Design an enzyme around this catalytic site. Structure first.
Site, mmCIF file in Angstrom:
data_model
loop_
_atom_site.group_PDB
_atom_site.id
_atom_site.type_symbol
_atom_site.label_atom_id
_atom_site.label_comp_id
_atom_site.label_asym_id
_atom_site.label_seq_id
_atom_site.Cartn_x
_atom_site.Cartn_y
_atom_site.Cartn_z
ATOM 1 C CG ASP A 116 -2.223 0.874 0.824
ATOM 2 O OD1 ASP A 116 -2.213 1.878 0.281
ATOM 3 O OD2 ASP A 116 -3.341 -0.091 1.139
ATOM 4 C CB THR A 154 -6.645 1.616 -0.417
ATOM 5 O OG1 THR A 154 -5.624 2.635 0.138
ATOM 6 C CG2 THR A 154 -6.306 0.142 0.038
ATOM 7 C CG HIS A 413 -2.796 8.219 -0.973
ATOM 8 N ND1 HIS A 413 -4.021 7.356 -1.345
ATOM 9 C CD2 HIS A 413 -2.591 7.931 0.069
ATOM 10 C CE1 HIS A 413 -4.186 6.721 -0.163
ATOM 11 N NE2 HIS A 413 -3.149 6.967 0.542
ATOM 12 C CG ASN A 659 -25.033 7.706 -22.666
ATOM 13 O OD1 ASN A 659 -23.710 7.968 -22.983
ATOM 14 N ND2 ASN A 659 -25.418 6.671 -22.744
ATOM 15 C CG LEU A 663 -19.003 2.871 -24.065
ATOM 16 C CD1 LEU A 663 -20.130 1.668 -24.054
ATOM 17 C CD2 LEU A 663 -17.728 2.435 -24.316
ATOM 18 C CG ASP A 665 -23.882 9.665 -27.143
ATOM 19 O OD1 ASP A 665 -23.613 8.782 -26.217
ATOM 20 O OD2 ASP A 665 -24.072 10.987 -27.149
HETATM 21 C C1 LIG Z 1 -15.262 -0.911 -19.091
HETATM 22 O O1 LIG Z 1 -15.506 -2.152 -19.219
HETATM 23 C C2 LIG Z 1 -16.836 -2.748 -18.912
HETATM 24 C C3 LIG Z 1 -17.072 -4.122 -19.085
HETATM 25 O O2 LIG Z 1 -16.984 -4.525 -20.364
HETATM 26 C C4 LIG Z 1 -17.784 -1.885 -19.937
HETATM 27 O O3 LIG Z 1 -19.022 -2.067 -19.523
HETATM 28 C C5 LIG Z 1 -19.880 -2.980 -20.360
HETATM 29 O O4 LIG Z 1 -20.378 -2.242 -21.117
HETATM 30 C C6 LIG Z 1 -21.212 -3.102 -21.987
HETATM 31 C C7 LIG Z 1 -21.666 -2.128 -23.212
HETATM 32 O O5 LIG Z 1 -22.311 -1.079 -22.808
HETATM 33 C C8 LIG Z 1 -22.630 -3.364 -21.115
HETATM 34 O O6 LIG Z 1 -23.351 -4.239 -22.132
HETATM 35 C C9 LIG Z 1 -22.168 -4.082 -19.879
HETATM 36 O O7 LIG Z 1 -23.029 -4.224 -19.045
HETATM 37 C C10 LIG Z 1 -20.949 -3.340 -19.201
HETATM 38 N N1 LIG Z 1 -20.445 -4.117 -18.198
HETATM 39 C C11 LIG Z 1 -19.827 -3.750 -17.140
HETATM 40 C C12 LIG Z 1 -19.456 -4.732 -16.151
HETATM 41 O O8 LIG Z 1 -19.903 -2.512 -16.855
HETATM 42 C C13 LIG Z 1 -17.395 -0.522 -20.034
HETATM 43 O O9 LIG Z 1 -18.058 0.037 -21.312
HETATM 44 C C14 LIG Z 1 -16.017 -0.299 -20.343
HETATM 45 N N2 LIG Z 1 -15.615 1.296 -20.248
HETATM 46 C C15 LIG Z 1 -15.301 1.826 -21.349
HETATM 47 C C16 LIG Z 1 -15.003 3.380 -21.161
HETATM 48 O O10 LIG Z 1 -14.876 1.503 -22.334
HETATM 49 CA CA LIG Z 2 -22.225 7.446 -24.682
HETATM 50 ZN ZN LIG Z 3 -3.544 2.480 -0.533
HETATM 51 ZN ZN LIG Z 4 -3.045 5.806 2.431
#
Ligand SMILES: *[C@@H]1O[C@H](CO)[C@@H](O[C@@H]2O[C@H](CO)[C@@H](O)[C@H](O)[C@H]2NC(C)=O)[C@H](O)[C@H]1NC(C)=O
Ligand SMILES: [Ca+2]
Ligand SMILES: [Zn+2]
Ligand SMILES: [Zn+2]
Ligand SMILES: CC(C)CCC[C@@H](C)[C@H]1CC[C@H]2[C@@H]3[C@H](O)C=C4C[C@@H](O)CC[C@]4(C)[C@H]3CC[C@]12C
Ligand SMILES: CCCCCc1cc(O)c2c(c1)OC(C)(C)[C@@H]1CC[C@@H](C)C[C@H]21
Length: 776
Positions: A116, A154, A413, A659, A663, A665
């Site tokens: 840590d 952490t 931190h 949103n 990702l 839109d």
């Molecule tokens: C980070 O990874 C997660 C997991 O794959 C992505 O979230 C998934 O996104 C899909 C598409 O929208 C959904 O169907 C799932 O329900 C999500 N799963 C989880 C566990 O979150 C997420 O989009 C990713 N983030 C980025 C910025 O790419």
């Molecule tokens: Ca989006």
């Molecule tokens: Zn820590």
């Molecule tokens: Zn600490």
């Protein structure tokens, strides 16, 4: 009701059955004789020569009797003191070309040694201070530093390491958080954190169990001494095949504790680092004792660093807000504000109110996209990004001091994860890691995929880029492949006459500009490739603007002005139907919206070519406030980068993330259009700037590795984020851009494009390039 013969057993036990495991103290559940039988400490942790050959005494913490090797409970230095062997650290580096594991091992075990608050720079202390860790580092594979996730606390970082997910996706968005659906709070101290409802994703210990790979319990009650944690892992490694775990975790609370007390720089940090090294040495000595020191893969990894922070550098919300008692604040090295009130009033009251203000408020949707810190109901809408070395608190009364007037802490931190003091360590050692190899810094989200590879596991979906860390490993069982393009481009010729356009507007080879191939569009849409003397674009007939615009600027390129007769010029594109073009009258009717261009007229190669830059197919909607930023980037900074890097290739374009999920839109998710129009308003604009890593070669004639810097600029209608924006753009615009630096991978998520598809580089190398972040 007794722990006899079951100390630190791996079999789970339920209530009211008393337990004898790693966490029985944390659940108030240990059998009456747990402390007596399982937490022995008599005679310490080291054999001495006088103890060699002793008759077994079950009271001792560890054993030096001739039967201890068969019982699996020798002290870790037994063979050194009693059998004349050498300490592991004293032995010469020898490459581990294949695992050397007992018959009946089905895979090399993985041992994760987590520390840590281990700042990356602590490694620059000697083998004098940390000889065992230095030997792991120099003999194995290491990075100069590993980047944590935001916030650099952490619980978010340990759980990110375990899942491969950003905190906004795994749900542990702070050490403390409020969930409005639960109507409950989560804290480091207390029983709430033991409730499974808080924890999303799929952590390594669960991925392993679901796929038939046994995990040792990763968690240790604070009552268990470090030395006993090591001995327990070593005892589990001696179990029979059908019981022995393949993956293990050791956790140390140090050096975080002394870092908080004394700060990261004092001489007081030396002895905590020596003690961690001693524990690493017991582990390696113990592995060598079991003849497992060329069988096990060991990861030495931190969660975050440590910065110089004192209570004397605290900003107080009560100096900004009219009534701080109608708000709740998560304080410290970050701020999260919610109602205990009107958000817009609160943001305004916190914005550039004092000259050297040491925090900046953001609505979470406006935070730098590289933090990926918005898409979770536990993340408050109002966020404060605190300057390194500082704290924010609610009122002066919240600052505690000793009677002498000194603070209780000198380090902390939690800050922005690109801050140098927040970086932490990574070393990998063993048969599956490379030998004596240095790798570039990487983000801790990437490690879950690698640990899955090390164990033969299929990773759960996560935010790592699988393949981007293949260069850490001597043997790769995962080979990435480029995604296939989903939509194919049209190449429309001259289709229409100028007189066919409605349209409101008035105006008075491509070997050079697409250096790494055309970006692939990874969703279904309709788009056109458009060639020009100075730039190429992929123009979307659905969003009525380019998805990307690509152009190359040489070191010697000249910047020119926009002639006066062209100031408001916009020209129809006879290659693109009037029905798939923007309408200039929309911008006239939208009093708050102006427009800009993706390829800048400033960089045209000739007066004739400049007319191409004013095509309606190069135009994008831009707030006047944002045009200050964009015009400076286009007119000043691109030329600067070209002059510094021996030419640059630039790919710019829009991003729509209404949103704030990181990702691209869909059309239905777009929440703002140019007034009275179908023209969608981007939330951000990106640019990806590539050159030759070997700057002695021009960007367009690069034989080898590439160099990239990218940005995701927020498309905002004011420059409230920039407290110096009243000044010339040379005083604030580049600082804004550096704050909004981004990975190419971040832009790919937000656009649905795939870059660098036609290069001389391996795909593994390109994946590493796409995860690079220029931190400044
Ligand atoms: C980070 O990874 C997660 C997991 O794959 C992505 O979230 C998934 O996104 C899909 C598409 O929208 C959904 O169907 C799932 O329900 C999500 N799963 C989880 C566990 O979150 C997420 O989009 C990713 N983030 C980025 C910025 O790419
Ligand atoms: Ca989006
Ligand atoms: Zn820590
Ligand atoms: Zn600490
Ligand atoms: C008091 C400290 C010394 C130890 C506190 C440990 C606590 C955070 C740990 C203990 C058990 C953990 C959960 C357990 O592994 C089951 C899972 C399944 C997984 O799918 C989601 C995570 C979860 C709930 C673990 C979360 C962390 C826990 C509670
Ligand atoms: C995946 C491989 C690297 C690390 C695995 C790991 C070990 C842990 O011990 C913990 C991890 C993660 O994450 C949480 C659960 C948030 C913990 C919160 C309490 C701490 C006392 C220890 C914890």
């Amino acid at each position: 009701g007794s722990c006899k013969g079951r100390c630190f057993e791996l079999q789970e036990v339920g209530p009211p059955d008393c337990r004898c495991d790693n966490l029985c103290k944390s659940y108030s559940s240990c059998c009456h004789d747990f402390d007596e039988l399982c937490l022995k400490t008599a005679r310490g942790w080291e054999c001495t020569k006088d103890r060699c050959g002793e008759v077994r005494n079950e009271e001792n913490a560890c054993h030096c009797s001739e039967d201890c090797l068969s019982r699996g409970d020798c002290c870790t230095n037994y063979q050194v003191v009693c059998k004349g062997e050498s300490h592991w650290v004293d032995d010469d580096c020898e490459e581990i070309k294949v695992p050397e594991c007992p018959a009946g091992f089905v895979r090399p075990p993985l041992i994760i040694f987590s520390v840590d608050g281990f700042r990356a720079s602590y490694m620059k202390k000697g083998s004098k201070v940390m000889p065992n860790i230095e030997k792991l580092r120099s003999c194995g594979t290491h990075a100069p530093y590993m980047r944590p996730v935001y916030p650099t606390k952490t619980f978010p970082n340990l759980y990110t390491l375990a899942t491969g997910l950003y905190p906004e996706s795994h749900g542990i968005v702070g050490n403390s958080m409020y969930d409005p659906v639960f109507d409950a709070s989560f804290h480091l101290r207390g029983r709430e954190k033991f409730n499974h409802r808080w924890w999303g994703g799929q952590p390594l210990w669960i991925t392993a169990t679901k796929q038939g790979v046994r995990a040792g319990t990763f968690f240790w009650s604070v009552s268990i001494p470090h030395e006993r944690r090591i001995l327990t892992i070593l005892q589990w490694l001696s179990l029979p095949d059908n019981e022995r775990p393949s993956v293990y975790a050791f956790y140390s609370e140090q050096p975080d504790f002394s870092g908080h007390k004394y700060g990261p720089f004092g001489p007081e940090m030396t002895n905590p680092l020596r003690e961690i090294d001693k524990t690493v040495g017991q582990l390696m000595d113990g592995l060598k004792q079991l003849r497992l020191h060329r069988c096990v893969n060991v990861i030495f990894v931190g969660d975050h660093g440590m910065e110089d922070v004192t209570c004397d550098r605290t900003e107080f919300l009560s100096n900004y807000l009219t009534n701080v008692d109608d708000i709740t604040l998560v304080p410290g090295t970050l701020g999260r504000i919610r109602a205990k009130y009107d958000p817009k009033t609160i943001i305004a009251a916190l914005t550039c109110k004092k000259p050297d203000q040491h925090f900046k408020p953001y609505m979470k949707q406006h935070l730098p996209k590289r933090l990926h810190y918005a898409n979770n109901r536990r993340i408050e809408d109002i966020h404060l990004l605190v300057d390194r070395r500082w704290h924010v608190a609610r009122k002066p009364l919240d600052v505690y001091k000793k009677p002498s007037g000194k603070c209780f802490f000198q380090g902390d931190h939690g800050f922005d994860n690109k801050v140098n003091s927040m970086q932490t360590v990574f070393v990998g050692y063993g048969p599956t890691f490379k030998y004596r190899t240095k790798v570039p810094p990487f983000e801790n989200i990437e490690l879950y995929n690698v640990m899955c590879d090390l164990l033969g596991l299929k990773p759960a979906p996560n935010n790592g880029t699988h393949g981007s860390l293949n260069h850490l490993l001597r043997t790769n069982t995962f080979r990435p492949t480029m995604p296939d393009e989903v939509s194919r481009p049209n190449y429309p010729g001259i289709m229409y006459l100028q007189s066919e356009f409605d349209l409101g507007c008035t105006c008075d080879t491509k070997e050079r500009h697409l250096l790494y191939g055309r970006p692939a569009v990874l969703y279904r849409t309709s788009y056109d490739i458009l060639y020009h003397t100075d730039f190429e674009s992929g123009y979307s007939e659905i969003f009525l603007m380019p998805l990307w615009t690509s152009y190359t600027i040489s070191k010697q390129a000249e910047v020119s002005s926009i002639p006066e007769h062209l100031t408001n010029c916009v020209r129809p594109d006879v290659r693109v139907s009037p029905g798939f073009s923007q309408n200039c009258l929309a911008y006239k009717n939208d009093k708050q919206m102006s427009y800009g261009f993706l390829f800048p007229p400033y960089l045209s190669s000739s007066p004739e070519a400049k007319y191409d830059a004013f095509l309606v197919t190069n135009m994008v909607p831009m707030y006047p406030a944002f045009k200050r930023v964009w015009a400076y980037f286009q007119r000043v900074l691109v030329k600067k980068y070209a002059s510094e890097r021996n030419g640059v290739n630039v790919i710019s374009g829009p991003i729509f993330d209404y949103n704030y999920d990181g990702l691209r839109d869909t059309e239905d998710e777009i929440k703002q259009y140019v007034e009275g129009s179908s023209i969608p308003v981007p939330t951000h604009y990106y640019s990806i700037i590539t050159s030759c890593l070997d700057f002695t070669q021009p960007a367009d004639k690069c034989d080898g590795p590439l160099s990239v810097s990218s940005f995701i600029l927020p498309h905002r209608p004011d420059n409230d984020e920039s407290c110096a924006s009243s000044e010339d753009e040379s005083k604030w615009v580049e600082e804004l851009m550096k704050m909004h630096t981004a990975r190419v991978r971040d832009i790919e998520h937000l656009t649905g494009l795939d870059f660098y598809r036609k290069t001389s580089r391996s795909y593994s190398e390109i994946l590493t390039l796409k995860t690079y972040l220029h931190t400044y």
